[PDB]
A = this chain, B = another copy of it.
Amino acid sequence: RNITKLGNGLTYLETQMQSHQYMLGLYELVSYLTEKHSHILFESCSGGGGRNDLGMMRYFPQVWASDNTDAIARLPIQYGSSYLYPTISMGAHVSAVPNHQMGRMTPLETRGLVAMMGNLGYELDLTNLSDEEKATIANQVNLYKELRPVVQLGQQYRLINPDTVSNEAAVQFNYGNQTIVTYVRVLSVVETMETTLKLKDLDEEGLYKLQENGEVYSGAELMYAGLTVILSQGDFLSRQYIFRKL
């Protein structure tokens, strides 16, 4: 919650000071604790991202970016949450459907890919899942263990921004020999030419092998011609392209 009813000073002046003194007290508290227990990973939170600033990030190396865990609603949130702050900070959880905040069904694949553009966790009752859903989750976890260095340690490139008008989002990460691209489309479209999606910051002469089809593309092709992005009919579909520089 936020602070109301300021009047604990013995004078008006001491009350005027109490909001900043509060912050000094918090920083004394958290600096003490995080430093004394330097092996514990502390994650900051304030009904999600109610206090996601560089003051807190000095002591808490990750933050619960938002209570909104909808995969689609997360797109603009993650766009802003990683705009000035590194992806490694940005907590993101696969949650249940229908989503508790938006009242929305999203594909588990899309919940997966969106959360994996952040610092991945899970926040749903695994015991109430089918055997299939569990398998999918196990596969998502195996995938991210692979992607985790690229996402958390790598360089982020926004390719299509989920702004107030866009129907799409696309984010690229480079890390040494690894390049990944996640594409999400919000609403189904029809009789509309496929988006052309160009990658950034590659070696022009580099040879980039696309895991899904084994095809090898020069960095020049991927940056200057780009990928025809193909999706089936439907809302909230996503895909990922994984490349290894040879």
Residues of A within 8 A of B (CB): 68, 72-73, 98, 101-105, 164-165, 186-188, 190, 232-235
Contacts and interface: CB of A to CB of B under 8 A. Distances in A.
Copies in the complex: 4
Contact of A101 (B186, B232, B233): B233
Question: What are the 9 tightest A-B residue pairs by CB atom distance, in nearest-first order?
Answer: A103-B233, A103-B234, A102-B188, A165-B165, A104-B188, A103-B188, A101-B190, A104-B235, A102-B233
Contacts of A105: 105
Contacts of A72: 187
Contacts of A103: 188, 232-235
Nearest to A167: B164
Contacts of A104: 188, 233-235
18 contacts: A68-B190, A72-B187, A73-B188, A98-B234, A101-B190, A101-B233, A102-B190, A102-B233, A102-B234, A102-B235, A103-B232, A103-B233, A103-B235, A104-B234, A104-B235, A105-B105, A164-B165, A186-B187
Contacts of A68: 190
Given A103-B232, A103-B235, A164-B165, 6 more contacts: A72-B187, A101-B190, A102-B188, A102-B233, A104-B234, A235-B235
B73 A190 contact: yes
Nearest to A101: B190
